[PDB]
C-alpha cells in the first residue's frame, strides 16, 4: 500500500532528523586534546601450531588461560595458552565450522557452521571424554556466530537472516529475532548479558533485547556486508567491521555513528574486531594478512600485528586484557602481548 | 623444571598432537569435490551411482572421494564459498534439456560464470557434466535451439547443438591458462561418469604434484 510506504518513509526521515539534531560535535573534536597512546609494540609471545587448515573462529575462556579454536579440519582444540598445551581435541561431525564459543562457566563449548546446527559439547564428564551434550537444529541457514549466556542459554546467529535464543536443556528456540534482510555474520553479547548486537550482510547492525524478541535500535552507515561486531567494555557502545575496509563505532544511547576507522592504503575487508580491557584500543583483523591496532578515541592507527601469512579470520582479547589471540587462514594461532 | 602434573599434561598434549597428525594424514589422502548446479539439473542423478551441506562418500580404484553437495543453502554464496577453496575439483551439472523455457540454460551460464571466474577458484579445475542427453535429443528433434541461442547459425542436429552448447559453456572461462574445464556428456548406460571424474581428478592431482615439486 502506498500509504504504508509513505508512513515508513516519513518515519525514517524523522529518525534521521532526530539523529542529526542529536549530532552536535563529533568524537574527534572532543578527543583532540587527549594525548595519543603512541606506537603500540606487540610481539608474538606464543604460537599455537596444532591445526592443519584455515582457522575460522576462536574464543577465550572466562579465565585468561584457556582458549578454543575451530578450523576446517573438523577439530575443536582447547589450548593452554600459557604453555601452548592441548587440553582437548574434539572431533566434529561436520567439518564446515565457522563459529566457536566458550561457556562462561568453562564446562561447555559450542560449534556450528554450514551444517545449520549448533552443537554443545560437555568438557567435564565422569567418563573423561568430551561428548556432544545437545545439537540445536532449528536454523535453515549456516551458523555464523554463537555466544553463551550461561550453561543453559545460548544465542546463535545464522545465515537465514534470523538470530535465535536457545534453551539447551530442551533444545528448542526460546526466542527468535527476525529483523534482518540479509545473512547475519556476527554476534556480540553485552557485559550484563541483557542485550546483544548483530551484524548482517544488509550493511546494518541491530540491537536486540534478549529478554523478549525485540529490535530496540537499528544502526546503519556501512557500505558493505558487516563481518564482525564487538561490544565496548563499558557496554554502551559497539564496533563493527565490514568489507569496505572501514570499522565504525556506534553508541546505543546516542543511536548514531561516532567514529570511522579507515585508511587509504587499506582496501581489504575486516574479518574480526575486538576491544582492549579499557576500550582505548580497537584491534581489527584484516585481509591484508595482518591485524591493525586502532586508537579507539583518536581514530589513528597505533600498531600492526604482521605475524600471519594469510587472512586473519578471528581475533580475541582476554578478559583481563593480558594478551591478544589472533587466528588466521594459515593453521596458526598467535598470542600477542 | 616441570612438575609431575606438568610433565603428564605435556605428554597428553603430545599424544593429542600425534592423533591430530594421523587424522590430517588420513584426510589429506581424500579427494574433495564440490558439487554445484541448478535446482532441476541432474545433480541427484550424478550422485545416484556410487538440512544444510549434504556430504557423499564413495571409493573408486582405492581413491576416497568426498562430494559436498551444497544445494540446500539459500544464503549468499559470497560469505561461504571461500570455505571450499582448496577442493580438488568442482563438479558442475547442467541439464541439456533446460533450454526450453523458464531460460534455465541462461541461469546455468550465469552460475557457471560466477563459479569459474571467482577469486577463490582461480586454479581449481571444473568437471562440467551435461545431463539428460537423451531427452535433449528428443526435444531438439522437434523444438529449435534458437530459443535459447538467438545468435546461432547451425543445423538442428544433436551433434552440432551439443557441440555448440559445450563451446558456449567453455568459452566463459577467463582463466584458460591456470584452470582447465573437463566436459562429459553424462550417460546412464554404465559407470562412465565415475571414470571421467577419476580421470579429471588424477589430472588435477598430477598438476598439483608438479606444482609442489616446482616443475609445473
Amino acid at each position: 500500500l502506498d500509504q504504508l510506504r509513505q508512513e515508513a518513509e516519513q518515519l525514517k526521515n524523522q529518525i534521521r532528523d532526530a539523529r542529526k539534531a542529536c549530532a552536535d560535535a563529533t568524537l574527534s573534536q572532543i578527543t583532540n586534546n587527549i594525548d595519543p597512546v603512541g606506537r603500540i609494540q606487540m610481539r608474538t609471545r606464543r604460537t599455537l601450531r596444532g591445526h592443519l587448515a584455515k582457522i575460522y573462529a576462536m574464543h577465550w575462556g572466562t579465565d585468561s588461560r584457556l582458549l578454543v579454536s575451530a578450523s576446517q579440519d573438523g577439530k575443536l582444540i582447547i589450548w593452554d595458552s600459557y604453555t601452548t598445551n592441548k587440553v582437548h581435541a574434539i572431533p566434529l561431525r561436520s567439518s564446515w565450522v565457522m563459529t566457536c564459543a566458550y561457556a562462561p562457566s568453562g564446562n561447555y563449548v559450542a560449534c556450528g557452521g554450514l551444517d545449520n546446527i549448533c552443537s554443545i559439547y560437555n568438557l567435564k564428564t565422569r567418563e573423561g571424554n568430551v561428548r556432544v551434550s545437545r545439537e540445536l537444529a532449528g536454523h535453515t541457514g549456516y551458523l555464523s556466530c554463537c555466544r553463551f549466556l550461561d550453561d543453559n542459554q545460548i544465542v546463535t546467529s545464522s545465515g537465514d537472516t534470523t538470530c535465535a535464543l536457545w534453551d539447551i536443556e530442551t533444545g528448542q528456540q526460546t526466542t527468535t529475532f527476525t529483523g534482518h534482510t540479509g545473512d547475519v555474520m556476527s554476534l556480540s553479547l553485552a557485559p550484563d548479558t541483557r542485550l546483544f548486537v548483530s551484524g548482517a550482510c544488509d550493511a546494518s547492525a541491530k540491537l536486540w533485547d534478549v529478554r523478549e524478541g525485540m529490535c530496540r535500535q537499528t544502526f546503519t552507515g556501512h557500505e558493505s556486508d558487516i563481518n564482525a561486531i564487538c561490544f565496548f567494555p563499558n557496554g554502551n557502545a559497539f564496533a563493527t567491521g565490514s568489507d569496505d575496509a572501514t570499522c565504525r563505532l556506534f553508541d546505543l544511547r546516542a543511536d548514531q555513528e561516532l567514529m570511522t576507522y579507515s585508511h587509504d592504503n587499506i582496501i581489504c575487508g575486516i574479518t574480526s574486531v575486538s576491544f582492549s580491557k579499557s576500550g582505548r584500543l580497537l584491534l581489527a583483523g584484516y585481509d591484508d594478512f595482518n591485524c591493525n591496532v586502532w586508537d579507539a578515541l583518536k581514530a589513528d592507527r597505533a600498531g600492526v600485528l604482521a605475524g600471519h601469512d594469510n587472512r586473519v579470520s578471528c581475533l580475541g582479547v582476554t578478559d583481563d586484557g593480558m594478551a591478544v589471540a589472533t587466528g588466521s587462514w594459515d593453521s596458526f594461532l598467535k598470542i600477542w602481548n | 623444571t616441570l612438575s609431575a602434573e606438568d610433565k603428564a599434561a605435556v605428554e597428553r598434549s603430545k599424544m593429542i598432537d600425534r592423533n591430530l597428525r594421523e587424522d590430517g594424514e588420513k584426510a589429506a589422502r581424500e579427494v574433495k569435490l564440490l558439487l554445484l548446479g541448478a535446482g532441476e539439473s541432474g545433480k541427484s542423478t550424478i550422485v545416484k551411482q556410487m538440512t544444510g551441506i549434504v556430504e557423499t562418500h564413495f571409493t573408486f580404484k582405492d581413491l576416497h572421494f568426498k562430494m559436498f553437495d551444497v544445494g540446500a543453502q539459500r544464503s549468499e554464496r559470497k560469505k561461504w564459498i571461500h570455505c571450499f577453496e582448496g577442493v580438488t575439483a568442482i563438479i558442475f551439472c547442467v541439464a541439456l534439456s533446460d533450454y526450453d523455457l523458464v531460460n534455465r540454460m541462461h541461469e546455468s551460464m550465469k552460475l557457471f560464470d560466477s563459479i569459474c571466474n571467482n577469486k577463490w577458484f582461480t586454479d581449481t579445475s571444473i568437471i562440467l557434466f551435461l545431463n539428460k542427453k537423451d531427452l535433449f535429443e528428443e526435444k531438439i528433434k522437434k523444438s529449435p535451439l534458437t530459443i535459447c541461442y538467438p545468435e546461432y547459425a547451425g543445423s538442428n542436429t544433436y551433434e552440432e547443438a551439443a557441440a555448440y552448447i559445450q563451446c558456449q559453456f567453455e568459452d566463459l572461462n577467463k582463466r584458460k591458462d591456470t584452470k582447465e574445464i573437463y566436459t562429459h556428456f553424462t550417460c546412464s548406460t554404465d559407470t562412465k561418469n565415475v571414470q571421467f571424474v577419476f580421470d579429471a581428478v588424477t589430472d588435477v592431482i598430477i598438476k598439483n604434484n608438479l606444482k609442489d615439486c616446482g616443475l609445473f
Partner: single-chain antibody
Amino acid sequence: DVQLVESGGGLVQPGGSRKLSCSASGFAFSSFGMHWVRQAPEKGLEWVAYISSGSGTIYYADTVKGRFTISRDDPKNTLFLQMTSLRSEDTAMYYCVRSIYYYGSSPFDFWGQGTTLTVSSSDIVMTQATSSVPVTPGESVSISCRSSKSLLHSNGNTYLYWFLQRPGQSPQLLIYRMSNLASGVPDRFSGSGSGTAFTLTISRLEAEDVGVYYCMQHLEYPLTFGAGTKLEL
C-alpha cells in the same frame, strides 16, 4: 557409571609371581593414567606404581622397583600388575586409582574397590602428627598435615591431595591441589594452607565423615601419603 573392579588376590607363598588385574568400565580408560596404591592391614596407604596414558611413562616405588611390573592393555580396558618375588612386606590391599592429567583436571578422583593380598610367613616426608581426635556430629574440626619440602611450585599451585577412607570403603578424593573441591564432595569440606603447612576444615561435620584422612603430595615421584588421621564417635 565409573567402575573399577580388581581381582587376583588370595594366599601367596613367598617367592611367588602372582599377577593382579584391574577391569575398568564406564570411562575412557585409554586416556586415563592409572596408579596402583596398596594399604597394609592396619597401616596407611602407599603408592606402588603408575603408568601414563599411552604407556609412555612408567614409575615405580623404591620398595617394589625391579620386582613389580605394571602394564595396561587398552582394547579390553584392563590394567595389570605383575608382582614377582613377593615377600611378607607385600601383604596389603591393592587399589586401582585412575588419574587424568591436564590443566584444571582432578587426578585420583576415582578409586577401585580394593583387592586383598596375603603373603604367608630424598623422598618428601608427609607428616600428619595426629592419629585420632574426638568429634561429635554438628561440630567443626581442623585436620592438619605437614610436609618436609615446600609443595608450592613455581607454577603457583601446591600439589596436595586429601583422601577420606571410610570404614570398609575405598579412599575417596575430597580436595586436590590443596584448594579445589572434588566433584560430588559437599561444600562442608575445605582445604587451605601454605608451603609445608596445610589444614583440612570439615565445618559442621556429621555422619559419613567418620574414617581416616590421608594427605598426599604430587609434587614429584615417588608419591607419599601421610600416616592417616582417624575420626571416631
